[PDB]
Write an enzyme that holds these catalytic residues in place. Structure first.
Site, PDB file in Angstrom:
ATOM      1  N   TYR A  86       1.211  18.655 -32.853  1.00 14.23           N
ATOM      2  CA  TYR A  86       1.200  19.723 -33.882  1.00 14.23           C
ATOM      3  C   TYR A  86       0.463  19.173 -35.105  1.00 14.23           C
ATOM      4  O   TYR A  86      -0.467  18.407 -34.910  1.00 14.23           O
ATOM      5  CB  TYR A  86       2.611  20.255 -34.145  1.00 14.23           C
ATOM      6  CG  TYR A  86       2.624  21.652 -34.705  1.00 14.23           C
ATOM      7  CD1 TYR A  86       2.079  22.670 -33.959  1.00 14.23           C
ATOM      8  CD2 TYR A  86       3.040  21.946 -35.997  1.00 14.23           C
ATOM      9  CE1 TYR A  86       1.988  23.951 -34.447  1.00 14.23           C
ATOM     10  CE2 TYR A  86       2.957  23.234 -36.505  1.00 14.23           C
ATOM     11  CZ  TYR A  86       2.449  24.251 -35.713  1.00 14.23           C
ATOM     12  OH  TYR A  86       2.317  25.550 -36.123  1.00 14.23           O
ATOM     13  N   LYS A 153       3.416  25.419 -31.513  1.00 18.24           N
ATOM     14  CA  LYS A 153       4.701  25.735 -32.171  1.00 18.24           C
ATOM     15  C   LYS A 153       5.734  26.101 -31.104  1.00 18.24           C
ATOM     16  O   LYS A 153       6.873  25.601 -31.207  1.00 18.24           O
ATOM     17  CB  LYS A 153       4.561  26.857 -33.200  1.00 18.24           C
ATOM     18  CG  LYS A 153       5.748  27.004 -34.141  1.00 18.24           C
ATOM     19  CD  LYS A 153       5.876  25.892 -35.180  1.00 18.24           C
ATOM     20  CE  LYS A 153       6.813  26.276 -36.316  1.00 18.24           C
ATOM     21  NZ  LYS A 153       6.440  25.587 -37.573  1.00 18.24           N
ATOM     22  N   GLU A 224       3.791  32.397 -38.070  1.00 21.95           N
ATOM     23  CA  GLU A 224       3.277  31.021 -38.272  1.00 21.95           C
ATOM     24  C   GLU A 224       1.855  31.100 -38.831  1.00 21.95           C
ATOM     25  O   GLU A 224       0.966  31.778 -38.252  1.00 21.95           O
ATOM     26  CB  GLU A 224       3.342  30.189 -36.978  1.00 21.95           C
ATOM     27  CG  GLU A 224       2.980  28.720 -37.208  1.00 21.95           C
ATOM     28  CD  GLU A 224       4.049  27.833 -37.845  1.00 21.95           C
ATOM     29  OE1 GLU A 224       5.197  28.314 -38.091  1.00 21.95           O
ATOM     30  OE2 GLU A 224       3.738  26.627 -38.072  1.00 21.95           O
ATOM     31  N   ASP A 225       1.644  30.422 -39.943  1.00 23.86           N
ATOM     32  CA  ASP A 225       0.285  30.089 -40.418  1.00 23.86           C
ATOM     33  C   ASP A 225      -0.450  31.369 -40.865  1.00 23.86           C
ATOM     34  O   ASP A 225      -1.681  31.451 -40.662  1.00 23.86           O
ATOM     35  CB  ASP A 225      -0.445  29.318 -39.311  1.00 23.86           C
ATOM     36  CG  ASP A 225      -1.284  28.153 -39.808  1.00 23.86           C
ATOM     37  OD1 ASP A 225      -1.024  27.675 -40.929  1.00 23.86           O
ATOM     38  OD2 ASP A 225      -2.160  27.709 -39.064  1.00 23.86           O
ATOM     39  N   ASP A 248       6.908  28.633 -42.290  1.00 20.62           N
ATOM     40  CA  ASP A 248       6.184  28.060 -43.459  1.00 20.62           C
ATOM     41  C   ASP A 248       6.987  28.322 -44.745  1.00 20.62           C
ATOM     42  O   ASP A 248       7.161  27.402 -45.541  1.00 20.62           O
ATOM     43  CB  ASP A 248       4.791  28.672 -43.612  1.00 20.62           C
ATOM     44  CG  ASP A 248       3.867  28.396 -42.447  1.00 20.62           C
ATOM     45  OD1 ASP A 248       3.854  27.253 -41.962  1.00 20.62           O
ATOM     46  OD2 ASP A 248       3.165  29.328 -42.052  1.00 20.62           O
ATOM     47  N   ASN A 395       0.942  18.492 -48.271  1.00 18.29           N
ATOM     48  CA  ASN A 395       0.147  18.236 -47.038  1.00 18.29           C
ATOM     49  C   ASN A 395      -1.282  18.737 -47.271  1.00 18.29           C
ATOM     50  O   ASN A 395      -1.499  19.629 -48.086  1.00 18.29           O
ATOM     51  CB  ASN A 395       0.787  18.957 -45.844  1.00 18.29           C
ATOM     52  CG  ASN A 395       2.208  18.507 -45.569  1.00 18.29           C
ATOM     53  OD1 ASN A 395       2.434  17.363 -45.171  1.00 18.29           O
ATOM     54  ND2 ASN A 395       3.170  19.398 -45.770  1.00 18.29           N
TER      55      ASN A 395
END
Ligand SMILES: O=C(Nc1cc(S(=O)(=O)Nc2ccc(OC(F)(F)F)cc2)ccc1Cl)c1cc(F)cc(F)c1
Ligand SMILES: O=C(Nc1cc(S(=O)(=O)Nc2ccc(OC(F)(F)F)cc2)ccc1Cl)c1cc(F)cc(F)c1
Lengths: 540, 540
Positions: A86, A153, A224-225, A248, A395
């Site tokens: 990941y 994921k 996700e994302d 997230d 990050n």
């Protein structure tokens, strides 16, 4: 039909007698191995590759041949394997090596299939689907190649919580891409057009959510994302009508909050005595602060307004106050200082002078703008507390506010540190220090396993706060004495079972649970949750 | 069950209408491609990897997903792909990356299965098997990892001659290994013991040949990559009782002979005027010389004893003669000079002084001992002939007697060159030169396709000589005018169909053919052979 089925294939773990009985004697080399031996062999095969992307490539081929051995290897080497299977390897695989996801069962949506979403779901031929990860490839733009993010994921829910690998669906909603290289790439296989406007975007994503709630009624839908223009709005649109969450936003705040409250216990500086610089004031950074307040209010029954006043928010302009004379975005108003003069606000612009004025005991790094937690700033926090809490959470690893090594050095071992990424231990005068990684794996699998078992009508913020508290309470006296803010990542199955149990008990207390088969008392339910979990061992 | 079957899967080549009809709409990204477009995409994916072994790794995963697309890609890029999907990449994959062969259907034999060889073959569940490649991993020792050599070789019969990929079997006979690293390697999956003695070796290999002739009666058995202590003896043991050949021995000599006779035509220096230094005097080097003599005798009806006297054999002692005073090995006696004095033999030791004495018109490099065809030696051959024939055939590329570039330079474009490995073109005064690669792919596929169709009781040396002549005669007037010794490698399907046709007609002339369905006249048989060949196109 044994060897070619990756779910029942055991390779060399087939005993000689099994090979004879199954008429596959002579389809394998003669050595018989145990699973543990196969895992050690695969591990050496992985480390025969230098580049993360080639390690990932090897692991994809292990998953295609022997799915049990794939998950056994990840679980035996979880901390080392995570950056490969990941973030950040998975984004680089999606961006440049999207072919590594071609063989993985998933579902592609786009406007061409408008009105047929439900028939595509039916035809995909799934049984009692428990978890769905959807992205649009937009938090560079990967467009259709975002399917790799959903795939990676889904695999962490199987590894982390024992979601059965046959009961999880990765989904790309392709609404176009603004990635100009892709729009000109002859080898791009997605919709070759710029991202759709919000009206058509929500028409397709509404059809998706309606079709899934009908064809996959038992599923948790996890976003996700998704980019900032949509991720918050998506949760506001769907949170009450469907069984869905965004890892997230909600997972991150749940994990950080759990680790932060454990850092407060080790500091001895209690929650109402904390003074917390929140470096970065986007919606996510403010969400994390609110989740910390909400958990401290739940665990300790301090008035939440008293917790909110421990926070000092810093945006790009400086300390967020009511007297600094600008029009504050809505998300920033609730954490705005009311006790700072216009004159002082004008002198509270750089992080250095904010830290000198506020005298914080904690620095929360959510800034996304590089290493702002300077030697000088860390030295100042040292005059306000014997145990500075420093959380460089930005990050990728380049954006981080400070290296845990620098934090430990400048504080001579006094800093309590949680990171977004793994870091090696630092040794100071014979004493060893290691940051606690706030990995999202601590929460989403447990939530997905809890919501898969409890079948709640929706996932209200109470279930996320319950998971946050559950994770916090799993860090043992022993973990805490050794400076850990989280239970060990290696124990993810036990962590997931506990998080799932507490999420279920919360859905039961709220009477939103739709599964009447479950135990309703913690010990019996925890035992039941553990037995329900898919285990990467050779079962039949 | 469409997408997961690599034989019928088409991926993006499924039209929208096919996707709807097959209920896989939404299992693929939306772009529809033709096969040609898929091949160009795969080609770019391959060149995204730098190392041969990682290119091979990508191609193995293409073969696992979409077998039609795999073969389509190899055929469209054959010359470039060959060093990746067989020698030298395949040996390095077997030695260090043997996991790249785990998913490939094959058959493993060893002493533990003694007496059960036939039941293992039955259980493998094959239909009318046409070709079997067997090795023992011994021409470093790979032992069991030799299965990768059989796999790579089987794939060249499918690509080269359209052997149906479901009718070919790769086999490892594991009789142990003398590779000391493997014997100590925890991850070695083979028989962990030194190679068996000849008595037990032949008991197991005899059981293999008997079991295969019974369970796979239609098969050609091809020996690949057996060491010198056994490869010659194996052919003497089995050549008459079974349908078998050794490509290293018989294929190599067939290909080299065809190219050499074409080099003689371009030299204008006719066969009986040639003077040929054969540098290297092992059994294989002497086999190549005999195959050249046999082809020239067949194509031109010169007395074979007159052809044998054009050869000057050089071993490690020097010119092989009857007067040099040593006890000559049997294979060297037939090519030994009878016309050289003891006194002259004593002065005929270094290649330089042998070349000065013999005044050769040809140098054949079969020496395996590095670059012995010096600038000085090439300059000397230039005073004996306007077109020196120079064949640096020693593999790998390091062992080669001279670079084609050096050959062309030193002769100012006059050298006629064939190589063991591909080399780029060399340009001299605006004129372009390129060696003709004597690849074994020119002969073995055609032999396997001919013997699969004709079903001969055995493969006598006449069928190999026929294939050698057929290959020679395929080089067109146009090919020859442009300096080519072989038909183009890219045209391998047409080459294989022609070689197969001529091999069949030879088996018919000898009345050893067992298939009465075949045409018996060349035009009708060639048309029939071409239609029988498996084509990497989407058929259904
Ligand atoms: O299972 C098969 N073979 C096999 C499996 C193992 S294993 O013990 O299961 N380890 C293993 C596997 C795969 C991997 O990853 C890979 F493939 F990339 F190398 C790594 C490690 C060891 C040796 C072998 Cl030969 C097999 C499967 C088929 F669908 C078809 C077929 F012909 C054979
Ligand atoms: O066929 C499948 N997918 C697929 C195929 C193609 S393709 O057009 O056939 N090109 C292609 C393939 C494979 C390769 O090699 C690889 F896999 F290494 F990348 C390269 C190039 C393009 C896109 C996709 Cl998504 C598929 C197959 C399954 F068994 C399961 C499953 F869920 C999907």
């Amino acid at each position: 039909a044994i060897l070619t089925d990756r779910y029942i294939n055991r390779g060399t773990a087939f005993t000689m007698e099994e090979r004879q009985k199954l008429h596959i004697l002579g389809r394998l080399p003669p050595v018989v191995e145990t699973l543990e031996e196969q895992v050690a062999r695969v591990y050496g095969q992985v480390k025969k590759y230098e580049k993360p992307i080639n390690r990932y490539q090897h692991l994809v081929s292990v998953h295609s041949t022997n799915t049990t051995l794939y998950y056994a290897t990840i679980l035996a080497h979880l901390e080392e394997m995570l950056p490969i299977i990941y973030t950040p390897t998975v984004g680089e695989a999606c961006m440049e090596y999207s072919h590594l996801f071609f063989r993985e069962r998933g579902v592609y949506f786009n406007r061409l299939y408008k009105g047929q979403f439900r028939n595509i779901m039916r035809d995909a031929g799934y049984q009692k689907v428990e978890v769905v990860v959807i992205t649009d490839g937009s938090i560079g733009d990967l467009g259709s190649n975002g399917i790799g993010i959903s795939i990676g994921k889904c695999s962490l829910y199987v590894a982390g919580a024992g979601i059965d690998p046959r009961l999880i669906v990765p989904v790309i909603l392709d609404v176009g891409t603004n990635n100009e290289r892709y729009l000109q790439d002859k080898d791009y296989l997605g919709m070759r057009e710029k991202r759709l406007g919000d009206e058509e975007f929500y028409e397709l994503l509404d059809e998706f959510m309606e079709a899934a709630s009908a064809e996959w009624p038992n599923a948790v839908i996890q976003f996700e994302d998704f980019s900032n223009n949509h991720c918050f709005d998506i949760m506001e649109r769907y949170q009450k009508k469907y069984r869905c969450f965004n890892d997230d936003i909600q997972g991150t705040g749940a994990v950080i909050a759990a680790g932060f409250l454990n850092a407060i216990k080790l500091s001895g500086v209690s929650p109402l005595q904390q003074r917390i610089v929140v470096f970065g004031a986007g919606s996510a950074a403010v969400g994390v602060a609110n989740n910390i307040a909400a958990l401290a209010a739940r665990m300790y029954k301090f008035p939440v307004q008293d917790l909110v006043k421990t926070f000092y928010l810093v945006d790009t302009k400086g300390l967020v106050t009511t007297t600094r004379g600008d029009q504050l975005a809505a998300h920033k108003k609730l954490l705005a200082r009311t006790d700072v003069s216009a004159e002082d606000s004008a002198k509270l612009r750089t992080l250095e002078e904010i830290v000198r004025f506020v005298k914080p005991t904690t620095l929360l790094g959510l800034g996304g703008v590089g290493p702002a937690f300077t030697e000088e700033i860390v030295k100042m926090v040292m005059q306000n507390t014997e145990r500075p809490i420093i959380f460089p959470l930005s990050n990728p690893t380049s954006k981080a506010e400070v290296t845990p090594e620098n934090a430990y050095k400048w504080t001579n071992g006094a800093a309590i540190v949680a990171s977004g990424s793994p870091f090696p231990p630092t040794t100071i005068g014979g004493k060893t220090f290691k940051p606690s990684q706030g990995n999202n794996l601590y929460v989403f699998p447990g939530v997905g396993l809890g919501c898969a078992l409890a079948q709640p009508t929706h996932i209200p913020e109470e279930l996320l706060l319950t998971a946050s508290e559950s994770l916090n309470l799993l860090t043992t006296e022993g973990d805490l004495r050794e400076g850990r803010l989280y239970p060990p990542l290696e124990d993810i199955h036990n962590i997931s079972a506990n998080v799932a149990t507490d999420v279920i008990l919360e859905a039961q207390r709220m009477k939103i649970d739709n599964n009447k088969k479950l135990p309703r008392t913690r010990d019996e339910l925890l035992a039941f949750v553990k037995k329900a979990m898919w285990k990467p061992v050779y079962s039949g």
